[model samples]
Target: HWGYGKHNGPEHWHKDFPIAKGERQSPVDIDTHTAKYDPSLKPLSVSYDQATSLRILNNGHAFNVEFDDSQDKAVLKGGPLDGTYRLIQFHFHWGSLDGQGSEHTVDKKKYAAELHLVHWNTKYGDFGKAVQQPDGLAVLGIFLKVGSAKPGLQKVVDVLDSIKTKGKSADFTNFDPRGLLPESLDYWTYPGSLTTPPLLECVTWIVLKEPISVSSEQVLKFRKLNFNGEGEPEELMVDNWRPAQPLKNRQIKASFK
Candidate 1:
């Protein structure tokens, strides 16, 4: 029942999931001035297979595009990772307005939306087993700015209408998420947790510095979906993002100066 609503929002999450106040929480403000540049960090290599795209669903929180991670067909390696991580799913966080929505900010600046590509380390056996380990997950974060419409994103938006209510799902096969990425792979790396509840401190965050474009019209399509189930009073699934948390003692390293 934990949601972005006033009654069950982030401020209330700490009551049930104490880790919400953990030291290495995610969505921290990336201060470019303080982020150290590391030449040792290798370029991130992402390889996604279109055939592995399984489905898209309205999970009541945010719509997620689940992928088939049975084998090493689609994966991410290099960068800050010690081993290959298989792509499990990808989802988005957005606001009701275009002014702010992204979970992670750059230099205290918020973008219209954020895309999270979730991957689990193959060495950990599976996602369930990996979720509990310190170096188990690696999430790629991409900022979405309000500008020209993205064709890659449009393919996703077009399917939102079919999954308007919570728990609804539709076939979303043959969709390659790689096309949605920006030209630059330059990123800021750090240790963090899941932005949502149960806020596990297992994620290694890779937030890209460059952002992709998404028009206002395209964003409106996302707002049209309902967070509630078929009979529940229609609640819009907007602002499904956790605000920036304290950086604490963690250091942020940038792939570029």
Candidate 2:
């Protein structure tokens, strides 16, 4: 099985998943100077239903808050998208230390953590089918800085104790994800892939320019999670982020000047 270790890490992924080296791979370094502003890009529109949140689980890689995607209760539209995309699940990537964690870097700067809101285009039928097409997925990425504690993050953190081991899950409801977002919707958009395996190149990444704050203690709690399942040797779930990939023959578009 693949993991964030020397033997099974990102570097070794290409052996099994050849698409890891494919064009339009994700989590590229966002060079602010090189990013071009495009007025044609529209502002992003996100509408999430609090009740749509279903559960939180530790799927060996990272903890994810899955939403009910059977319908379009929570959806993302506009901003480089031709149609509405349904929100399926959201997860986080973090580091063992506070200095580096985020998958996508800005001007080579790293944040303590990164959050991904995964969505699938409606025209593609479902997430399974969507992942096969290039214009199938839209992932909204938000950087997390180490500072004051974020009120919105507390609920998710409080439940971490319940899902400390892989395969563990707990019911999570009435959590509005919008509360975790920064005030601005301004973002940088690009064609990219899933940061993790099978690393399909179907994601249209919309990375926010602004970041939300979470206290250092909050981040420490995230580290308590174990990548290993119960009764196995403990392996802390930190540094789960993938390194930045090459930006080949692709343009990064900015929604604002």
lDDT of each: 0.93, 0.95
- Top candidate by lDDT: 2
Poorest 10 consecutive residues by lDDT, candidate 2: 45-54
Q: Mark the regions of model 2 whose C-alpha exceeds 4 Å error after superposition.
A: none
At residue 188, candidate 2 shows an lDDT of: 98
For model 1, state the Cα shift of residue 41 in Å.
0.4
lDDT of 1 by residue, 1-257 (tens): 99999899988999999999999999899999999999999999998753389899999999999999998988999999999999999999998999899999998999999999999999998998898999999999999999999988889999999999999999999888988899999999999999987799999999999999999999999889888999899999899999999999999999997
* Candidate 2 lDDT, 1-257, residue by residue in tens: 99999999999999999999998898999999999999999999998853389899999999999999998898999999998899998999999999999999999999999999999999999999999999999999999999999999999999999999999999998888887899999999999999999999999999999999999889999999999999999999999999999999999999999
The TM-score between candidate 2 and the true structure equals 0.98
Report the error of model 1 at residue 153, Å.
Answer: 1.0
- What is candidate 1's TM-score against the reference? 0.98
